[PDB]
């Protein structure tokens, strides 16, 4: 009995027939009202024409279901009984499932009794009683040209830019974003999810001062690179960079540290790294959909399985929890609902860690 909730919303929009008349038909309605209602709810579109209960109050009183629906009481009490206007589809589905019930009854019930009727024919009775069932906007990047051919980076986005084990998803977040927190003032709450921050603070500074390739892990630096490290030391600890690294948990480490700081710093981005060993995937992936809804700002979520949508389409929501899913092969595009389909190229080096421009 979703029907009750299924019919009374073509008033709230009111063009809540834009998908509702792009989906089902009046038959699904059991009661002689709802059918001949939706039947005369499907004569508008001839022009057309458009949408109003009055265009139906001159329609169900014209073909007299005026005395054959539920009376005046039952007409307006549809506008009065449906709240969540953004459903429709949806929604109208459960009725087709109440009609999936109907898709079986007067099909099987026919056949079940056919051992007392078509007795007789059988091979005829077979292949028929079977063939029945045969149906800029635009929060920054640093290389300004990258908040453009896609257009940000904006409020409420699960911006996923993924790659294989240590290719792009590893340090990609240490590139684009260090121009949203260090360059403009839209601060962060970060999580290192391929290492501790002690190793995730040792990967981004490589970009500044042409440093970390001699290296720092084994030794130190050469004379002129200290006078180039002192020109790269004060844009991390000083900066509004506040990462978190906490071990095997579900998801609560974010929100246990990302609720108090809603009022303090400002929150312009929320940061996320790798996926497949933080202890399936969607109860951790939807934990970021209604988060950018509550905190209200662009967010980065780098997952793992090519990456195409298909190969991360079984190891993550990704297509759904995020319309936007860029990649790291180049930053391969797939599904965008915010800007034009212009593709781009910036060359990657693989040592000093820099995606230097074309």
């Amino acid at each position: 009995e979703a029907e009750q909730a299924v019919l009374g919303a073509v008033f709230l929009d009111p063009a809540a027939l834009v998908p509702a008349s792009e989906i089902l038909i009046p038959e699904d309605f059991y009661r002689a009202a709802h059918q001949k209602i939706f039947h005369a709810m499907l004569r508008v579109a001839d022009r057309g024409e458009p949408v109003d209960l009055v265009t139906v109050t001159a329609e169900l009183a014209a073909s007299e279901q005026l005395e054959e629906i539920g009376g005046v009481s039952y007409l307006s009490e549809l506008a009065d009984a449906v709240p969540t206007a953004a459903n429709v589809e949806y929604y109208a589905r459960i009725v087709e499932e109440k009609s999936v019930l109907r898709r079986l009854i007067r099909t099987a019930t026919s056949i079940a009794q056919d051992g007392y009727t078509r007795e007789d024919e059988i091979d005829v009775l077979l292949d028929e009683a079977d063939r029945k069932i045969m149906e800029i906007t635009g929060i920054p990047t640093g290389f300004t040209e990258l908040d453009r051919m896609t257009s940000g980076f904006q409020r409420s986005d699960l911006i996923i830019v993924a790659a294989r084990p240590s290719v792009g998803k590893t340090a990609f977040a240490l590139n684009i974003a260090q121009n949203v927190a260090t360059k403009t003032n839209e601060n962060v709450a970060i999580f290192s999810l391929e290492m501790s921050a002690q190793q995730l603070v040792m990967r981004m500074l490589c970009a500044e001062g042409n440093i970390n390739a001699q290296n720092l892990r084994t030794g130190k630096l050469t004379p002129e690179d200290w006078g180039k490290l002192t020109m790269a030391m004060g844009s991390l600890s000083n900066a509004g960079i506040y990462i978190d690294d906490t071990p095997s948990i579900r998801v609560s480490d974010i929100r246990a540290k990302c609720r108090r700081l809603k009022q303090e710093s400002g929150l312009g981005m929320i940061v996320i790294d790798y996926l497949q060993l933080i202890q399936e995937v969607s109860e951790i992936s939807r934990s970021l959909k209604a988060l950018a809804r509550e905190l209200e700002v662009p967010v980065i979520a780098l997952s793992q399985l090519r990456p195409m949508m298909s190969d991360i389409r079984e190891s993550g929501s990704i297509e759904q929890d995020a319309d936007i899913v860029a990649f790291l092969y180049e930053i391969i595009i797939a599904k965008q609902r915010n800007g034009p389909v212009g593709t781009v190229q910036l060359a990657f080096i693989k040592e000093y860690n820099k995606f230097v421009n074309l």
Partner: protein, 138 residues
Amino acid sequence: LLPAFQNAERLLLAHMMRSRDVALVVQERIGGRFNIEEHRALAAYIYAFYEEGHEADPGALISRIPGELQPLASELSLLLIADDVSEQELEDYIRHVLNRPKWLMLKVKEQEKTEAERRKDFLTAARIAKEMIEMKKM
């Protein structure tokens, strides 16, 4: 079986039974303007304590205020909250009480609206919907 708003009006007769500089702004906000028939005089006994200056507490106030207003204001102190209050919980009950009246504005005129139903009017009686549906869209 207490409804939604009855407690948002109570988001005052407890937030000013325990904090009165979280009650001076109510004078500015909810005059009122109050909803319930006995909940107006309660406010009328709240702001009048702010002038004389004595020991303000959960239960020291609720005796001023003789009888009936105690198996009511005492039952307004058998509650389950605290004194850590937000700026967008202060900007919330702004609508709540004073606007529950506007939920009424789709009842007493429906008596008229639904009496156009009995005369079989659907020409003009099917318009007050816009002066209802798209009246709640503010």
